[PDB]
């Protein structure tokens, strides 16, 4: 088991690549501000975590920002706030201002040189295609929710990618998933055969278990650096 027995990284992006929840305390600061009270990064992730679950559907909404908007109504009525109309939009389009974690543009270049990349988001393409330009890298296969018409952790998201691979010549087998979250990636990862990569990024939604994980590295760094040593014998 070798991070050189693989010649695709499937890759989760939000978690993994870009930090989310930096994006989220972000983009809740003019709401939060307007309380006039100071949230830990904690509590704010908490108060978006709880609104944000109500929203959760079968079938994918075409457009994220929906999610965000709907999650912005329901925070500031939690607030004792008013919604304001241009706050919304802000808070709404805030995906693209999401930041990557420091370390994840040059892993990728890096990464990008020995691997074909590919990403399953369940944020929607034109949302990724801003955030893409953050990070560094094209990537050789993009696979969205909208696209297979469930959220991760369905097991059609995982079929729909591992079909797509094979019939642009990556058999199962040479495939490592590579992923923070236990719950949406890396369960469905082991009911699908692939082998995992678990980013962990602050570790230390809930997994009905802990899946299998081949590899663990803290950061997308850490992966790149271990296949630099991988190479030196």
Same mark, same amino acid.
């Given at each position: 088991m070798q991070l050189t027995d693989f010649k695709a990284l499937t890759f989760d992006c939000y978690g993994t690549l870009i930090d989310w929840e930096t994006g989220i305390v972000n983009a809740l600061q003019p709401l939060a501000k307007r309380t006039g009270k100071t949230?830990?990064?904690? &509590?704010?992730? &908490?108060?978006?975590?709880?609104? %944000?679950? @109500? *929203? *959760?559907?079968?079938?994918?909404?075409?457009?994220? *920002?929906?999610? $965000?908007?709907?999650?912005?109504?329901?925070?500031a009525? &939690?607030?004792? $706030?008013? @919604?304001?109309?241009? %706050?919304r939009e802000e808070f709404g389009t805030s995906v693209k201002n999401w930041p990557a974690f420091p370390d994840t543009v040059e892993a990728l270049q890096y990464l990008k040189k020995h691997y074909k990349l590919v990403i399953l988001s369940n944020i929607d393409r034109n949302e990724f295609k801003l955030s893409n330009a953050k990070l560094g890298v094209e990537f050789d296969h993009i696979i969205t929710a909208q696209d297979v018409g469930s959220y991760k952790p369905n097991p059609n998201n995982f079929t729909y990618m591992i079909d797509a691979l094979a019939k642009a010549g990556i058999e199962k087998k040479?495939?490592? +998933?590579?992923? &923070?979250?236990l719950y949406h990636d890396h369960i469905p990862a082991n009911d699908a055969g692939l082998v995992s990569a678990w980013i962990y990024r602050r570790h230390g939604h809930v997994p009905s278990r /802990?899946?299998?994980?081949? !590899?663990? !590295?803290?950061?997308?760094? %850490? /992966?790149? %650096?271990? +296949?630099?040593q991988?190479?030196?014998?």
């Open positions: 949230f830990t990064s904690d &509590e704010l992730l &908490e108060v978006f975590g709880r609104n %944000e679950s @109500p *929203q *959760q559907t079968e079938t994918p909404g075409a457009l994220y *920002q929906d999610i $965000l908007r709907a999650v912005y109504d329901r925070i009525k &939690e607030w004792g $706030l008013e @919604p304001d109309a241009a %706050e040479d495939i490592l +998933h590579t992923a &923070e979250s /802990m899946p299998n994980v081949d !590899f663990r !590295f803290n950061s997308m760094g %850490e /992966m790149a %650096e271990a +296949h630099k991988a190479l030196k014998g």
